[PDB]
Amino acid sequence: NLFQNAKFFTTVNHLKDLPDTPLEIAFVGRSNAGKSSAINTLTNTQHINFFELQNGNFMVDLPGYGYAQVPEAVRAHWVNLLGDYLRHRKQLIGLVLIMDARHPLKELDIRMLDFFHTTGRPVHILLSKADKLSKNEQIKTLSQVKKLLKPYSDRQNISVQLFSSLKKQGIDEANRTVGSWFDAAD
Amino acid sequence: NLFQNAKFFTTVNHLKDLPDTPLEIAFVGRSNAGKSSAINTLTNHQHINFFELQNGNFMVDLPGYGYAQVPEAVRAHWVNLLGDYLRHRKQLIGLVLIMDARHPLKELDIRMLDFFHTTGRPVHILLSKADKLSKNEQIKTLSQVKKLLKPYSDRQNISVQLFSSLKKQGIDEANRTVGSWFDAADA
Ligand SMILES: Nc1nc2c(ncn2[C@@H]2O[C@H](COP(=O)(O)OP(=O)(O)O)[C@@H](O)[C@H]2O)c(=O)[nH]1
Ligand SMILES: [Cl-]
16 A cells, blocks of 8 residues: 555655655666566656655655666766665665566675665565566575575565566565555654 | 884873874774784784884774674764764874675774765775685675775775785785875875
8 A cells, every 4th residue: 555655756866966855765676667667566867766655754766777777887886876875875764676586686786785784774675577487486586585685684674575567466565565664663 | 014013102092182193094993803913913013002103103003893792882982982083083194994804894884984984085994814715705705895885985095905914915015005195195
């Protein structure tokens, strides 16, 4: 239900110009198309998009860090800026990390998890495009990814789910998990 | 060698009692990072220790943070005092941050880098106890630490090396790097 109430609020061009939100969660990932599809499924030139949730809380969609998702000449700088945002954004209470289920935990995915890990805040992973895998492959990939992330449990509660925008699969768990973060924070 | 034959000068427990040194560099790190061993290796030898370098300037050894044996309130007090020193010490020209190569860049390491970042001064990282990692693990850790520190390069010259007190690995680069800071200060 939490994401169904989201309303687009404002777009900002530079992290330097972020508004002072009460509380926010961030969506990050390699692929703009996969991340946009997930957000569209959850809510029914890429820039920084703020969506208003209930009670003055916010979700922030940040430009993807994969090839071509921002111009290649500035992508290294963007990775550093986004990494610094994860490390330092004081009102960021949780991270939604979107990764293609066929190719999870690429180097930049892990770098973003490392940038965020010192916060001790929770991460929820959507293994997107789950419909591209057989059901047995989906189950195996989910367990493999969870096992690979166990070292982050020294500081963080990491949760992982399969997600499909095409099949509308996984909406309830995403709402439940992110909802619990704001309930805890409020 | 910048650090060779450095001599102990004084020990202070309060920032009010700091000597009015001409120029200094500071050593910081988490408790059990290997900072005392690294200083002994470099020099061939809670409170703040001042050492006089042969060049007449000073090296400042600040007590390790995150020491699990002492109460949370004492740890927090020293985090605040360290941040005060790093942010405000006018004659501090560079920072040597020592981190256990097996577990680098913990939250308190980030906190110290953040305290010092507003100075624009250089930071040199020693990834210590490197001998406890395989050669490939040492290189991979070098790579990951350098990637995670790139955001600080917007305002500071950040350099990183592997270091082993036990195997006397990394001494030359540590001397050359910190020495260059004193050269640039002109004296
Ligand atoms: N293998 C190895 N052990 C080290 C090295 N430097 C320090 N140690 C060990 O790490 C522990 C903590 O070292 P110490 O210098 O006292 O750390 P400090 O608390 O940061 O001053 C000690 O047991 C040392 O024996 C090193 O280069 N290699
Ligand atoms: Cl940490």
